[PDB]
Write a protein that binds this DNA or RNA. Structure first.
Lengths: 507, 23, 94, 96
DNA sequence: GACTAGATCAGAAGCAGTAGAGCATGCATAGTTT
DNA sequence: AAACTATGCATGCTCTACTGCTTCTGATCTAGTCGACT
């Protein structure tokens, strides 16, 4: 998967789309606008390098390269930004609907062939490589052309041509007074006709709920940190790739701006002599360190050369039982090692054999690891990792090796000596009861970083000039009320059984 | 390929974080 | 599509004339009633020729696109024949 | 050494660098003119090419009295060497 | 020949991730002065 | 015995540099058309 994903939001501008079934309900047009805005915000937060477009059909005015009738391309394929969101915001309400009607109009005819032609033309203009081509149809008219059959045939032919080109088509059908029926006309235009998507739907599509669900977490495409060589010995070498399945998420780096006109500035660092005033490059100056009441002077090149031990890669040392590995010896986040057949042919077979035998014998490969040049070596353990799938066969644990760093003698710290006091069985039983009362299931994606979420919310509020920032609920805060209700009296019994009458833990 | 993220093709959709839910 | 049947038919015409192949290809893909008069067609052809003599292809493409979108299948066939300068009708110049 | 005059071009080296250089020159005994004046005899540039230097010379002459001696174009190397030695240094072709 | 337009390769820019140094802030711990 | 100051640790933010992977752009090249000549 290489390139960018392009999406086009086709929104019908027919009269039937501007009628609300109930007074306290959202019109289909407003729902489509809200979905587009949500997708825009999600793309800005997650993938800012993607391309989006917004096109309307069935209007009175037109704006397109080919100069068709009743097709107004509101926004062409361009990276998302706050300006487009603000522009779309002027159609959200009823006054926005009036503004949209005045600007473009509604109630005119249209031909789906022209719409698809305009979409294809928009796709062709983009110069960047596009991994995905996608179009979404926000409409509530299952029979766009019932009076004319030639128009339907032309639309079918254009949809087929687009499908052959490699353009995905999706139908976000909206509520209809009568009921949407895909079988009428949209069975062929839509790229994939699901078996369940054949009955008459009396409610908006379920995909709108997914679209409205804002995702405020960055998405990174698969990439290899390094492509190194595993050396069983001097003459047996295979090629492996290293990946970081877990990586800390950081706020985007701040940028320095000028106060007067918000124009970015450039920061430069320089070093000058005090007694002469001249400028010194980072080669005239030396390095120093005061040991034993004396000064030791080393050049920069020598200082860098102090760290040269061995060439980059992994060197095999032996195999160790997994029992000897310790959980509390954590030093650094682990990495993932996978075969890489491009550099060396035959690496995959040996890697698979090693993984199978390591799983069978429950052993881990001890290795010496050197990520880059002029970096001191470390001792790592490659633990086999089998392929684990979930109920729906979606892979949850890939096959390969888990690279875990092992601490040196300097990475451990001595602990103060503390006398051991053992609790009586009754206290342990009461604590067991409390623990059982406070039991819950844990998942790796059950928590979110409050700082990053609040930062994203504040940034969006500032960019869109919203009245107040949206407040993010913190799921990491203990539920004091629920815990108190569940525990009941157990806390009092434990405190009576473990603490003297006058202890005052807080004090 | 059920569960694929509509917003981001090629990435598996992630369920909303539920925090702690006692049994 | 580059590898589609229509593209192969158009490109591989045994260099049943090209006009008939184009007419068959465009019959299910074009309108049924045009709106271009003789004067507009003459102006577009004049622009195409003048731009060709000026070494410019973008405007030639624009004019051809306008002709394609504002013409039917029969009109496109006749325009192709006129451009190729091989209009055969069974009656000579005399 | 009141005989010689030294001027530093502000718009190409920065305010902080110019201030530091002027302070060092003053502490070393050199007299540096804060503002451009006809009495200036030496002009020092910083990170500049010949074209920009000659254009600056033309601009300065455009608002200078006739029958005078325009300063000589010099590089920052000359000033740094003079400050290091503690006394004015002879001018060479490289500095010019 | 010449022009124009298609398709192929290699270098530079962007980006991600790591390491080193400095700063600021806060806090804790222990030695010296009165 | 109490107050001030030297010393150290833990953590977040920022400049600066360096290495590696991916993508975009400038540069090196064959087919179609018109024209020149013989």
């Amino acid at each position: 998967y290489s390139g960018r994903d392009s999406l086009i939001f086709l929104v019908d501008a027919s009269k039937a789309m501007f009628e609300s079934q109930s007074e306290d309900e959202l019109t289909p047009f407003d729902m489509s606008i809200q979905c587009i805005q949500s997708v825009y915000i999600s793309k800005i937060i997650s993938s800012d390098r993607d391309l989006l477009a917004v096109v309307f059909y069935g209007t009175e005015k037109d704006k397109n390269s080919v100069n068709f009738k009743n097709i107004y391309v509101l926004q062409e394929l361009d990276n998302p930004g706050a300006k487009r969101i603000l522009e779309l915001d002027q159609f959200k309400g009823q006054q926005g609907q009036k503004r949209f009607q005045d600007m473009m109009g509604h109630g005119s005819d249209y031909s789906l062939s022209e719409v698809l032609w305009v979409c294809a033309n928009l796709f062709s203009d983009v110069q960047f490589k596009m991994s995905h081509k996608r179009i979404m149809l926000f409409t509530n008219e299952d029979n766009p052309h019932g009076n004319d059959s030639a128009k339907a045939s032309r639309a079918r032919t254009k949809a087929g041509d687009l499908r052959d080109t490699g353009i995905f088509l999706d139908l976000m059908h909206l509520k209809k007074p009568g009921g949407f029926d895909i079988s009428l006309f949209y069975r062929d235009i839509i790229s994939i006709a699901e078996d369940e998507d054949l009955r008459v739907h009396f409610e908006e599509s379920s995909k709108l709920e997914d679209l409205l669900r804002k995702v405020r977490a960055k998405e990174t495409r698969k990439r290899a940190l390094s492509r190194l060589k595993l050396k069983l010995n001097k003459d047996i070498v295979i090629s492996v790739g290293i990946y970081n399945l877990v990586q800390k998420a950081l706020k985007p780096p701040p940028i320095k701006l000028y106060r007067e006109t918000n124009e970015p500035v450039k920061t430069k660092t320089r070093t000058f002599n005090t007694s002469t005033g001249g400028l010194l490059l980072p080669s005239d100056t030396k390095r120093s360190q005061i040991y034993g009441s004396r000064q030791i002077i080393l050049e920069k090149e020598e200082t860098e050369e102090l760290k040269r031990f061995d060439d980059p890669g992994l060197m095999l040392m032996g195999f160790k039982p997994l029992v000897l590995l310790k959980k509390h010896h954590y030093l650094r986040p682990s990495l993932f090692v996978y075969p890489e057949e491009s550099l060396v042919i035959g690496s995959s077979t040996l890697f698979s054999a090693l993984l199978i035998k390591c799983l069978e014998k429950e052993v881990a490969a001890l290795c010496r690891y050197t990520p880059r040049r002029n970096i001191p070596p470390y001792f790592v353990a490659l633990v086999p990792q089998e392929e684990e799938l979930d109920d729906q066969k979606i892979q949850v644990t890939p096959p390969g090796f888990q690279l875990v760093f092992l601490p040196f003698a300097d990475d451990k710290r001595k602990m103060p000596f503390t006398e051991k006091i053992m609790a009586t069985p009754e206290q342990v039983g009461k604590m067991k009861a409390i623990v059982e009362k406070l039991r819950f299931t844990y998942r790796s994606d059950s928590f979110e970083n409050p700082v990053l979420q609040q930062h994203f919310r504040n940034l969006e509020a500032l960019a869109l000039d919203l009245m107040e920032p949206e407040q993010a609920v913190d799921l990491t805060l203990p539920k004091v009320e629920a815990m108190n209700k569940r525990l009941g009296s157990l806390v009092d019994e434990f405190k009576e059984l473990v603490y003297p009458p006058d202890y005052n833990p807080e004090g | 390929c059920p569960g694929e993220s509509l917003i981001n093709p090629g990435f598996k959709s992630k369920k909303p974080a539920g925090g702690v839910d006692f049994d | 599509p580059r590898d589609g049947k229509d593209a192969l038919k158009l490109l591989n015409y045994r260099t049943g004339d090209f006009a008939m192949i184009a007419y068959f290809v465009l019959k299910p893909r074009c309108l049924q009633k045009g709106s271009l008069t003789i004067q507009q067609v003459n102006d577009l052809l004049d622009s195409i020729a003048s731009n060709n003599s000026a070494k410019r292809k973008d405007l030639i493409k624009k004019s051809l696109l306008q002709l394609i979108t504002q013409s039917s299948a029969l009109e496109q066939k006749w325009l192709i024949r006129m451009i190729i300068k091989d209009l055969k009708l069974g009656v000579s110049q005399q | 050494f009141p005989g010689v005059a030294i001027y530093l071009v502000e718009p190409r080296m920065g305010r902080s660098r110019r201030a530091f250089l002027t302070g060092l020159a003053r502490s070393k005994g050199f007299r540096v003119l804060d503002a451009c004046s006809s009495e200036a005899t030496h002009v020092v540039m910083e990170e500049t090419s010949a074209e920009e230097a000659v254009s600056w010379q033309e601009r300065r002459m455009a608002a200078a009295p006739p029958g005078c001696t325009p300063p000589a174009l010099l590089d920052i190397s000359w000033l740094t060497e003079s400050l290091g030695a503690g006394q004015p240094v002879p001018v060479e072709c490289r500095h010019r």
